[PDB]
């Protein structure tokens, strides 16, 4: 464990907090339409594949891989 993260600081430039985890992003990242995510979180939510090239889909306010997304957008409906 690190048990660090020390350093007193006042105001700070606004950062696009990731959606998957929920933490202020810094540096390289994947900016979504109206949302923001990390360069590693951008991966699918079901399995976790790099949607960098493949791409991400919108289902129930979530992101998945065409492989999973298609299955969700097409099929049953979980209340
Ligand atoms: Zn994240
Ligand atoms: Zn998936």
> 31 with 16: CB under 8 angstroms?
yes
How far apart are the CA of 20 and the centre of ligand 1, in A? Answer: 5
SS3 71: helix
Give the determination technique. NMR
In the chain, what are the domain boundaries? Answer: 15-74
- Report d(CA 48, CA 40) in Å as an integer: 9
Closest ligand to residue 43's CA: 2
Q: Is 31 exposed, middle or buried (0-12, 13-18, 19+ CB in 10 A)?
A: exposed
Surrounding residues of ion ligand 2, Cβ less than 5 A:
44, 46-47, 65, 68
18 annotated binding-site participant: yes
The fold of the 15-74 domain, in CATH, is: 2.10.110
Neighbours of 24 (CB within 10 A): 12
Q: Are 60 and 51 in contact (CB under 8 A)?
A: no
């Amino acid at each position: 464990g690190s048990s660090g993260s020390s350093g007193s600081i006042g105001n700070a430039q606004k950062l696009p907090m990731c959606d998957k985890c929920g933490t202020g992003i810094v540096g390289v990242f994947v900016k979504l339409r109206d949302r923001h995510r990390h360069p590693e979180c951008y991966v699918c939510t079901d399995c976790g594949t790099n949607l960098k090239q493949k791409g991400h889909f919108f289902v129930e306010d979530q992101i998945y891989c065409e492989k999973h997304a298609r299955e969700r957008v097409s099929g049953p409906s979980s209340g």
